[PDB]
From a paper:
Tetracycline destructases (TDases) are flavin monooxygenases which can confer resistance to all generations of tetracycline antibiotics. Type 2 TDases have thus far been predominantly identified through soil functional metagenomics with one sequence found in the soil-derived human pathogen Legionella longbeachae. These two types differ in their resistance profiles, with type 1 enzymes conferring resistance to all tetracycline antibiotics including third-generation drugs while type 2 enzymes are generally limited to only first- and second-generation tetracyclines. We determined the X-ray crystal structures of two of these new sequences from Legionella species, and confirmed anhydrotetracycline can inhibit these enzymes’ inactivation of tetracycline antibiotics.
Tet(56-2) and Tet(56-3) are most closely related to Tet(56), at 87.4% and 87.9% amino acid identity respectively, and have 88.6% amino acid identity to each other. Tet(56-2) and Tet(56-3) were also identified in the genomes of Legionella species: [name] and L. massiliensis, respectively. We determined the X-ray structures of Tet(56-2) at 1.80 resolution with Rfree/Rwork of 17.43/20.93 and Tet(56-3) at 2.39 Å with Rfree/Rwork of 21.69/24.85. The structures of Tet(56-2) and Tet(56-3) show that the FAD binds in an “OUT” conformation, a conformation that was previously confirmed in X-ray structures of other type 2 TDases. Additionally, we observed that the loop containing F95 shows a distinct conformation in the Tet(56-2) structure, in which F95 is oriented away from the substrate-binding channel, thus presenting the loop with an opening for substrate to enter the active site. The FAD-interacting residues are conserved between both structures. While the apparent catalytic efficiencies (kapp/KM) of Tet(56-2) and Tet(56-3) are similar to Tet(50) for the inactivation of tetracycline and doxycycline, the KM and kapp for the inactivation of doxycycline by Tet(56-2) are 150 ± 42 µM and 3.2 ± 0.2 min−1 respectively. This is much larger than that of Tet(50) (KM and kapp values of 3.57 ± 0.44 μM and 0.15 ± 0.02 min−1 respectively), suggesting that while Tet(56-2) has a much lower binding affinity for doxycycline, the turnover rate is higher. The addition of 1 μg/mL anhydrotetracycline reduced the concentration of tetracycline required to inhibit the growth of Tet(56-2) producing E. coli two-fold, from 32 μg/mL to 16 μg/mL. Apparent IC50 values for anhydrotetracycline inhibition of Tet(56-2) and Tet(56-3) were in the low micromolar range (0.3-30 µM) for tetracycline and doxycycline inhibition.
Numbering used by the authors: 3 to 387
Protein backbone atom coordinates (compact mmCIF):
# COMPACT_ATOMS: atom_id res chain seq x y z
CA UNK A 1 0.00 0.00 0.00
CA UNK A 2 2.28 2.65 1.45
CA UNK A 3 4.04 -0.26 3.19
CA UNK A 4 7.81 -0.29 2.79
CA UNK A 5 8.70 -3.78 1.51
CA UNK A 6 12.29 -4.72 0.65
CA UNK A 7 12.93 -7.82 -1.48
CA UNK A 8 16.50 -9.13 -1.30
CA UNK A 9 17.69 -11.04 -4.37
CA UNK A 10 16.96 -10.78 -8.11
CA UNK A 11 16.91 -14.48 -9.00
CA UNK A 12 13.62 -16.30 -9.58
CA UNK A 13 11.73 -15.95 -6.30
CA UNK A 14 12.52 -12.27 -5.73
CA UNK A 15 11.37 -11.03 -9.12
CA UNK A 16 8.36 -13.33 -8.92
CA UNK A 17 7.17 -11.96 -5.59
CA UNK A 18 7.74 -8.40 -6.85
CA UNK A 19 5.38 -9.15 -9.73
CA UNK A 20 2.68 -10.47 -7.40
CA UNK A 21 3.17 -7.72 -4.82
CA UNK A 22 2.90 -5.04 -7.52
CA UNK A 23 -0.18 -6.69 -9.01
CA UNK A 24 -1.83 -7.00 -5.57
CA UNK A 25 -1.46 -3.28 -4.79
CA UNK A 26 1.94 -3.07 -3.06
CA UNK A 27 5.07 -1.09 -3.90
CA UNK A 28 8.09 -3.35 -3.37
CA UNK A 29 11.70 -2.38 -3.83
CA UNK A 30 14.17 -4.98 -5.13
CA UNK A 31 17.92 -5.23 -4.53
CA UNK A 32 20.67 -7.44 -5.99
CA UNK A 33 24.14 -7.93 -4.52
CA UNK A 34 25.76 -8.37 -7.93
CA UNK A 35 26.28 -5.54 -10.41
CA UNK A 36 23.79 -6.94 -12.93
CA UNK A 37 21.29 -9.77 -13.29
CA UNK A 38 22.96 -13.18 -13.17
CA UNK A 39 21.91 -15.27 -16.19
CA UNK A 40 23.97 -18.43 -15.75
CA UNK A 41 22.45 -21.78 -14.94
CA UNK A 42 21.26 -24.98 -16.60
CA UNK A 43 17.93 -25.51 -18.30
CA UNK A 44 15.07 -25.68 -15.82
CA UNK A 45 11.55 -27.02 -16.18
CA UNK A 46 8.32 -25.11 -15.64
CA UNK A 47 6.18 -27.96 -14.34
CA UNK A 48 2.83 -28.71 -12.70
CA UNK A 49 1.12 -25.92 -10.78
CA UNK A 50 3.85 -23.49 -11.83
CA UNK A 51 2.68 -23.62 -15.44
CA UNK A 52 -0.68 -22.20 -14.30
CA UNK A 53 1.11 -19.43 -12.41
CA UNK A 54 3.28 -18.62 -15.42
CA UNK A 55 0.06 -18.27 -17.45
CA UNK A 56 -1.59 -15.94 -14.93
CA UNK A 57 1.64 -13.91 -14.74
CA UNK A 58 1.40 -13.33 -18.48
CA UNK A 59 4.74 -14.98 -19.31
CA UNK A 60 3.81 -18.44 -20.63
CA UNK A 61 4.01 -17.48 -24.31
CA UNK A 62 7.35 -15.80 -23.72
CA UNK A 63 8.63 -18.93 -21.97
CA UNK A 64 7.42 -21.08 -24.86
CA UNK A 65 9.22 -18.84 -27.38
CA UNK A 66 12.47 -19.37 -25.45
CA UNK A 67 12.07 -23.13 -24.97
CA UNK A 68 15.14 -25.30 -25.45
CA UNK A 69 15.53 -26.93 -28.85
CA UNK A 70 17.90 -29.89 -28.44
CA UNK A 71 17.20 -32.23 -31.37
CA UNK A 72 19.73 -34.96 -30.53
CA UNK A 73 20.86 -36.21 -27.13
CA UNK A 74 23.79 -38.62 -27.09
CA UNK A 75 25.21 -40.61 -24.21
CA UNK A 76 28.85 -41.45 -24.85
CA UNK A 77 31.70 -43.27 -23.17
CA UNK A 78 34.95 -41.50 -22.34
CA UNK A 79 36.33 -42.36 -25.77
CA UNK A 80 33.34 -40.70 -27.48
CA UNK A 81 31.54 -43.85 -28.62
CA UNK A 82 27.77 -43.37 -28.76
CA UNK A 83 26.03 -45.68 -26.31
CA UNK A 84 22.48 -44.36 -26.79
CA UNK A 85 20.88 -41.60 -28.86
CA UNK A 86 17.61 -39.76 -28.16
CA UNK A 87 15.80 -37.27 -30.37
CA UNK A 88 13.64 -34.33 -29.43
CA UNK A 89 9.92 -34.03 -29.99
CA UNK A 90 8.53 -32.29 -33.07
CA UNK A 91 8.65 -28.49 -32.76
CA UNK A 92 10.43 -28.89 -29.43
CA UNK A 93 7.06 -29.10 -27.66
CA UNK A 94 5.93 -31.58 -25.06
CA UNK A 95 2.41 -32.96 -25.34
CA UNK A 96 1.59 -31.46 -21.91
CA UNK A 97 2.07 -27.90 -20.59
CA UNK A 98 5.61 -28.39 -19.20
CA UNK A 99 8.37 -26.30 -20.79
CA UNK A 100 12.18 -26.51 -20.53
CA UNK A 101 13.97 -23.15 -20.58
CA UNK A 102 17.43 -21.87 -19.69
CA UNK A 103 17.43 -20.28 -16.25
CA UNK A 104 18.90 -17.07 -17.62
CA UNK A 105 16.10 -16.77 -20.19
CA UNK A 106 13.48 -17.22 -17.46
CA UNK A 107 15.17 -14.58 -15.29
CA UNK A 108 15.12 -12.11 -18.20
CA UNK A 109 11.42 -12.75 -18.80
CA UNK A 110 10.59 -12.23 -15.11
CA UNK A 111 12.56 -8.96 -14.92
CA UNK A 112 10.55 -7.64 -17.89
CA UNK A 113 7.33 -8.13 -15.90
CA UNK A 114 8.56 -5.74 -13.16
CA UNK A 115 9.95 -2.86 -15.21
CA UNK A 116 7.88 -0.61 -12.91
CA UNK A 117 9.59 -1.94 -9.75
CA UNK A 118 12.73 -0.13 -8.52
CA UNK A 119 15.71 -2.48 -8.67
CA UNK A 120 19.09 -1.53 -7.20
CA UNK A 121 22.25 -3.47 -8.03
CA UNK A 122 25.52 -3.52 -6.07
CA UNK A 123 23.45 -3.21 -2.88
CA UNK A 124 24.59 -5.52 -0.09
CA UNK A 125 23.29 -5.65 3.47
CA UNK A 126 25.82 -5.92 6.29
CA UNK A 127 23.49 -5.61 9.32
CA UNK A 128 19.83 -6.34 10.05
CA UNK A 129 17.90 -5.58 13.24
CA UNK A 130 14.17 -5.56 13.85
CA UNK A 131 11.83 -4.29 16.54
CA UNK A 132 8.06 -4.37 16.87
CA UNK A 133 7.75 -1.45 14.41
CA UNK A 134 10.50 -1.54 11.77
CA UNK A 135 13.31 -3.54 10.23
CA UNK A 136 16.55 -1.55 10.31
CA UNK A 137 18.86 -2.34 7.40
CA UNK A 138 22.44 -1.06 7.18
CA UNK A 139 24.17 -1.38 3.81
CA UNK A 140 27.86 -1.59 2.96
CA UNK A 141 27.61 1.96 1.62
CA UNK A 142 26.83 3.10 5.14
CA UNK A 143 23.20 3.78 4.22
CA UNK A 144 20.52 2.97 6.78
CA UNK A 145 16.91 2.39 5.73
CA UNK A 146 13.85 1.40 7.75
CA UNK A 147 11.29 -1.02 6.33
CA UNK A 148 7.98 -2.50 7.41
CA UNK A 149 8.74 -5.91 5.84
CA UNK A 150 11.92 -7.53 4.50
CA UNK A 151 11.64 -10.60 2.24
CA UNK A 152 14.68 -12.79 1.84
CA UNK A 153 14.86 -14.08 -1.72
CA UNK A 154 18.64 -14.43 -1.69
CA UNK A 155 19.12 -18.13 -2.36
CA UNK A 156 20.42 -21.14 -0.49
CA UNK A 157 23.20 -19.05 1.12
CA UNK A 158 20.72 -16.36 2.24
CA UNK A 159 22.41 -13.58 4.16
CA UNK A 160 18.94 -12.53 5.30
CA UNK A 161 18.44 -15.95 6.88
CA UNK A 162 21.91 -15.78 8.48
CA UNK A 163 21.36 -12.36 10.06
CA UNK A 164 17.80 -12.87 11.31
CA UNK A 165 17.55 -16.54 12.31
CA UNK A 166 19.52 -18.33 15.00
CA UNK A 167 21.73 -21.12 13.71
CA UNK A 168 19.54 -23.66 15.54
CA UNK A 169 16.43 -22.53 13.61
CA UNK A 170 17.71 -23.83 10.25
CA UNK A 171 19.82 -26.70 8.91
CA UNK A 172 21.57 -26.93 5.55
CA UNK A 173 21.51 -30.63 4.68
CA UNK A 174 24.18 -31.68 2.15
CA UNK A 175 22.84 -34.43 -0.11
CA UNK A 176 26.33 -35.70 -1.01
CA UNK A 177 26.85 -34.17 -4.48
CA UNK A 178 27.83 -30.99 -6.34
CA UNK A 179 26.77 -29.16 -9.52
CA UNK A 180 28.66 -26.82 -11.82
CA UNK A 181 27.62 -25.16 -15.07
CA UNK A 182 29.03 -22.46 -17.33
CA UNK A 183 29.16 -21.35 -20.95
CA UNK A 184 32.23 -21.42 -23.20
CA UNK A 185 32.89 -21.04 -26.94
CA UNK A 186 31.29 -23.86 -28.96
CA UNK A 187 34.68 -25.36 -29.80
CA UNK A 188 33.15 -28.73 -30.78
CA UNK A 189 30.77 -27.11 -33.26
CA UNK A 190 27.73 -28.79 -31.77
CA UNK A 191 24.37 -27.89 -33.33
CA UNK A 192 21.21 -28.43 -31.23
CA UNK A 193 22.97 -31.44 -29.70
CA UNK A 194 23.74 -32.52 -26.13
CA UNK A 195 26.53 -34.95 -25.25
CA UNK A 196 26.73 -36.62 -21.83
CA UNK A 197 29.28 -39.00 -20.33
CA UNK A 198 28.81 -40.77 -17.00
CA UNK A 199 31.57 -42.62 -15.14
CA UNK A 200 32.92 -43.17 -11.65
CA UNK A 201 30.13 -41.34 -9.81
CA UNK A 202 30.59 -38.29 -12.08
CA UNK A 203 28.64 -36.80 -15.00
CA UNK A 204 29.87 -34.34 -17.65
CA UNK A 205 27.63 -32.76 -20.29
CA UNK A 206 28.06 -30.26 -23.08
CA UNK A 207 25.48 -28.87 -25.50
CA UNK A 208 24.86 -26.08 -27.99
CA UNK A 209 21.28 -25.10 -28.67
CA UNK A 210 19.89 -21.76 -29.76
CA UNK A 211 23.19 -19.83 -29.88
CA UNK A 212 25.50 -21.69 -32.29
CA UNK A 213 28.56 -19.81 -31.06
CA UNK A 214 28.41 -21.00 -27.44
CA UNK A 215 28.16 -24.29 -25.61
CA UNK A 216 26.95 -24.90 -22.07
CA UNK A 217 28.91 -27.32 -19.92
CA UNK A 218 27.63 -29.20 -16.89
CA UNK A 219 29.39 -31.18 -14.18
CA UNK A 220 27.74 -33.25 -11.44
CA UNK A 221 29.46 -35.54 -9.01
CA UNK A 222 29.23 -37.29 -5.68
CA UNK A 223 31.52 -36.06 -2.94
CA UNK A 224 31.54 -35.82 0.85
CA UNK A 225 34.24 -33.14 0.69
CA UNK A 226 33.18 -29.82 2.17
CA UNK A 227 34.87 -26.62 1.05
CA UNK A 228 36.66 -24.36 3.50
CA UNK A 229 34.70 -21.44 2.01
CA UNK A 230 31.76 -22.54 -0.17
CA UNK A 231 31.74 -19.04 -1.71
CA UNK A 232 35.45 -18.97 -2.72
CA UNK A 233 35.44 -19.34 -6.51
CA UNK A 234 39.13 -20.25 -6.65
CA UNK A 235 38.53 -23.12 -4.21
CA UNK A 236 35.43 -24.18 -6.18
CA UNK A 237 37.31 -24.32 -9.46
CA UNK A 238 40.28 -26.10 -7.94
CA UNK A 239 37.91 -28.70 -6.45
CA UNK A 240 36.18 -29.14 -9.80
CA UNK A 241 39.47 -29.59 -11.65
CA UNK A 242 40.86 -32.02 -9.05
CA UNK A 243 37.66 -34.04 -9.13
CA UNK A 244 37.72 -34.47 -12.93
CA UNK A 245 41.52 -34.76 -13.24
CA UNK A 246 41.37 -38.31 -14.64
CA UNK A 247 37.90 -38.35 -16.25
CA UNK A 248 39.17 -37.94 -19.82
CA UNK A 249 36.83 -37.31 -22.75
CA UNK A 250 36.23 -33.55 -23.21
CA UNK A 251 36.74 -32.59 -19.56
CA UNK A 252 40.12 -30.92 -20.02
CA UNK A 253 39.06 -29.05 -23.18
CA UNK A 254 36.04 -27.73 -21.26
CA UNK A 255 37.79 -26.93 -17.98
CA UNK A 256 40.63 -25.17 -19.82
CA UNK A 257 38.05 -22.70 -21.17
CA UNK A 258 36.61 -21.62 -17.80
CA UNK A 259 38.62 -18.36 -17.83
CA UNK A 260 36.67 -17.46 -20.98
CA UNK A 261 33.32 -17.95 -19.24
CA UNK A 262 31.38 -15.03 -17.79
CA UNK A 263 28.66 -17.02 -15.97
CA UNK A 264 30.41 -19.65 -13.82
CA UNK A 265 28.12 -21.39 -11.31
CA UNK A 266 29.07 -23.92 -8.65
CA UNK A 267 27.23 -25.16 -5.60
CA UNK A 268 26.73 -28.08 -3.29
CA UNK A 269 23.46 -29.98 -3.74
CA UNK A 270 21.74 -29.09 -0.46
CA UNK A 271 18.37 -28.61 1.21
CA UNK A 272 17.34 -25.88 3.65
CA UNK A 273 15.29 -27.26 6.56
CA UNK A 274 13.31 -24.85 8.75
CA UNK A 275 10.27 -25.24 11.00
CA UNK A 276 9.12 -21.71 10.10
CA UNK A 277 10.19 -19.45 7.24
CA UNK A 278 9.28 -16.18 9.02
CA UNK A 279 10.36 -14.27 12.13
CA UNK A 280 8.58 -11.07 13.09
CA UNK A 281 8.68 -8.80 10.04
CA UNK A 282 11.05 -11.06 8.03
CA UNK A 283 9.92 -13.76 5.58
CA UNK A 284 12.07 -16.09 3.48
CA UNK A 285 10.98 -17.31 0.04
CA UNK A 286 12.46 -19.75 -2.45
CA UNK A 287 15.78 -21.46 -1.81
CA UNK A 288 16.51 -19.14 1.13
CA UNK A 289 13.84 -20.91 3.14
CA UNK A 290 13.23 -24.35 1.63
CA UNK A 291 15.73 -25.13 -1.16
CA UNK A 292 14.76 -28.62 -2.43
CA UNK A 293 18.11 -28.91 -4.31
CA UNK A 294 18.84 -29.38 -8.03
CA UNK A 295 18.07 -33.12 -7.70
CA UNK A 296 14.39 -32.29 -7.05
CA UNK A 297 14.16 -30.49 -10.39
CA UNK A 298 11.69 -28.27 -8.56
CA UNK A 299 13.50 -25.28 -7.01
CA UNK A 300 12.13 -22.77 -9.52
CA UNK A 301 8.61 -24.16 -9.19
CA UNK A 302 8.68 -23.99 -5.39
CA UNK A 303 9.96 -20.43 -5.78
CA UNK A 304 7.00 -19.56 -8.01
CA UNK A 305 4.48 -21.02 -5.54
CA UNK A 306 6.07 -19.46 -2.45
CA UNK A 307 6.19 -16.00 -4.03
CA UNK A 308 2.52 -16.24 -5.06
CA UNK A 309 1.21 -17.44 -1.69
CA UNK A 310 3.18 -14.97 0.42
CA UNK A 311 2.09 -12.02 -1.74
CA UNK A 312 -1.52 -13.22 -1.72
CA UNK A 313 -1.66 -13.78 2.03
CA UNK A 314 -0.26 -10.28 2.57
CA UNK A 315 -3.08 -8.95 0.37
CA UNK A 316 -5.78 -11.01 2.09
CA UNK A 317 -4.51 -9.84 5.49
CA UNK A 318 -4.65 -6.17 4.43
CA UNK A 319 -0.91 -5.89 5.16
CA UNK A 320 -1.19 -7.50 8.64
CA UNK A 321 2.10 -9.35 8.32
CA UNK A 322 1.76 -11.52 11.42
CA UNK A 323 -1.41 -13.11 10.07
CA UNK A 324 -0.10 -13.34 6.51
CA UNK A 325 3.13 -15.01 7.65
CA UNK A 326 1.20 -17.54 9.74
CA UNK A 327 -0.95 -18.49 6.73
CA UNK A 328 2.10 -18.62 4.43
CA UNK A 329 3.84 -21.13 6.70
CA UNK A 330 0.74 -23.30 7.06
CA UNK A 331 -0.37 -23.35 3.42
CA UNK A 332 3.07 -24.10 1.92
CA UNK A 333 4.31 -26.70 4.41
CA UNK A 334 2.90 -29.84 2.80
CA UNK A 335 4.07 -28.85 -0.69
CA UNK A 336 7.58 -28.02 0.51
CA UNK A 337 7.82 -31.36 2.33
CA UNK A 338 6.65 -33.35 -0.70
CA UNK A 339 9.14 -31.63 -3.04
CA UNK A 340 12.04 -31.96 -0.57
CA UNK A 341 11.30 -35.65 0.04
CA UNK A 342 11.45 -36.25 -3.69
CA UNK A 343 14.86 -34.53 -3.89
CA UNK A 344 16.10 -36.72 -1.04
CA UNK A 345 14.80 -39.83 -2.82
CA UNK A 346 16.66 -38.95 -6.02
CA UNK A 347 19.83 -38.26 -4.05
CA UNK A 348 19.73 -41.79 -2.60
CA UNK A 349 20.73 -43.31 -5.97
CA UNK A 350 22.04 -40.39 -8.11
CA UNK A 351 25.48 -41.34 -9.47
CA UNK A 352 25.87 -43.73 -6.53
CA UNK A 353 26.83 -46.92 -8.40
CA UNK A 354 29.30 -47.01 -11.30
CA UNK A 355 27.34 -49.62 -13.25
CA UNK A 356 23.61 -50.22 -12.82
CA UNK A 357 21.53 -52.95 -14.44
CA UNK A 358 19.59 -51.71 -17.45
CA UNK A 359 16.43 -53.20 -15.94
CA UNK A 360 17.16 -51.35 -12.68
CA UNK A 361 17.97 -48.05 -14.39
CA UNK A 362 14.82 -48.20 -16.51
CA UNK A 363 12.47 -48.95 -13.60
CA UNK A 364 14.14 -46.15 -11.62
CA UNK A 365 13.81 -43.66 -14.47
CA UNK A 366 10.13 -44.48 -15.02
CA UNK A 367 9.28 -44.13 -11.33
CA UNK A 368 11.07 -40.77 -11.13
CA UNK A 369 9.07 -39.43 -14.11
CA UNK A 370 5.80 -40.51 -12.47
CA UNK A 371 6.77 -39.14 -9.05
CA UNK A 372 7.89 -35.73 -10.28
CA UNK A 373 4.55 -35.18 -12.03
CA UNK A 374 2.69 -35.89 -8.77
CA UNK A 375 5.05 -33.77 -6.67
CA UNK A 376 4.74 -30.83 -9.04
CA UNK A 377 0.94 -30.78 -8.58
CA UNK A 378 0.76 -31.57 -4.83
CA UNK A 379 -1.02 -28.38 -3.72
CA UNK A 380 -4.33 -26.56 -4.15
CA UNK A 381 -3.64 -22.90 -4.77
CA UNK A 382 -5.66 -20.23 -2.96
CA UNK A 383 -7.38 -17.57 -5.04
CA UNK A 384 -6.59 -13.94 -4.28
CA UNK A 385 -7.86 -12.05 -7.41
C1 LIG B 1 23.57 -17.72 -11.23
C2 LIG B 1 22.73 -18.88 -10.74
C3 LIG B 1 22.76 -20.08 -11.44
C4 LIG B 1 22.03 -21.19 -10.99
N1 LIG B 1 22.07 -22.37 -11.74
C5 LIG B 1 21.35 -23.40 -11.29
C6 LIG B 1 21.39 -24.64 -12.04
O1 LIG B 1 22.02 -24.85 -13.08
N2 LIG B 1 20.60 -25.66 -11.49
C7 LIG B 1 19.85 -25.56 -10.34
O2 LIG B 1 19.18 -26.54 -9.97
N3 LIG B 1 19.84 -24.39 -9.63
C8 LIG B 1 20.54 -23.36 -10.11
N4 LIG B 1 20.54 -22.21 -9.39
C9 LIG B 1 19.64 -22.12 -8.24
C10 LIG B 1 18.16 -21.91 -8.71
O3 LIG B 1 17.99 -20.63 -9.33
C11 LIG B 1 17.20 -22.07 -7.54
O4 LIG B 1 17.29 -23.43 -7.08
C12 LIG B 1 15.74 -21.74 -7.81
O5 LIG B 1 15.37 -22.01 -9.17
C13 LIG B 1 15.44 -20.26 -7.61
O6 LIG B 1 15.60 -19.94 -6.23
P1 LIG B 1 15.78 -18.46 -5.72
O7 LIG B 1 15.29 -17.33 -6.60
O8 LIG B 1 15.20 -18.58 -4.41
O9 LIG B 1 17.40 -18.32 -5.54
P2 LIG B 1 18.55 -17.97 -6.57
O10 LIG B 1 18.17 -18.35 -7.92
O11 LIG B 1 19.82 -18.60 -5.99
O12 LIG B 1 18.62 -16.39 -6.53
C14 LIG B 1 19.20 -15.68 -5.40
C15 LIG B 1 19.49 -14.26 -5.84
O13 LIG B 1 19.84 -13.46 -4.68
C16 LIG B 1 21.07 -12.80 -4.93
N5 LIG B 1 21.74 -12.59 -3.65
C17 LIG B 1 22.50 -13.49 -2.95
N6 LIG B 1 22.97 -13.02 -1.82
C18 LIG B 1 22.49 -11.72 -1.78
C19 LIG B 1 22.63 -10.68 -0.84
N7 LIG B 1 23.33 -10.80 0.29
N8 LIG B 1 22.02 -9.50 -1.10
C20 LIG B 1 21.31 -9.38 -2.22
N9 LIG B 1 21.11 -10.28 -3.18
C21 LIG B 1 21.73 -11.44 -2.90
C22 LIG B 1 21.82 -13.69 -5.91
O14 LIG B 1 22.84 -12.95 -6.56
C23 LIG B 1 20.67 -14.13 -6.82
O15 LIG B 1 20.34 -13.20 -7.84
C24 LIG B 1 21.26 -21.07 -9.83
C25 LIG B 1 21.23 -19.87 -9.12
C26 LIG B 1 21.99 -18.78 -9.56
C27 LIG B 1 21.95 -17.49 -8.76
Amino acid sequence: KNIKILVVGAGIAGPAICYWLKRFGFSPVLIEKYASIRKGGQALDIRGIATHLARVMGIYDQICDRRTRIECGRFVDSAGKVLHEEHGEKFGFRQDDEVEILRGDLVEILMKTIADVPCYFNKSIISMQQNADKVIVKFKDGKIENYDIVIGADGIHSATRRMIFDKNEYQLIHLGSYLSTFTIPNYLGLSHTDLECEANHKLVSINSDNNPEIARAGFMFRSQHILKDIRDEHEQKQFLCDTFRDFGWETQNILNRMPESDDFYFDAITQVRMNSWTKGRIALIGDAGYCPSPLSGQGNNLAFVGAYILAGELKTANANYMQAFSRYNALLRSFVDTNQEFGVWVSKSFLVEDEVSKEIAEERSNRILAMIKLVSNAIILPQYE
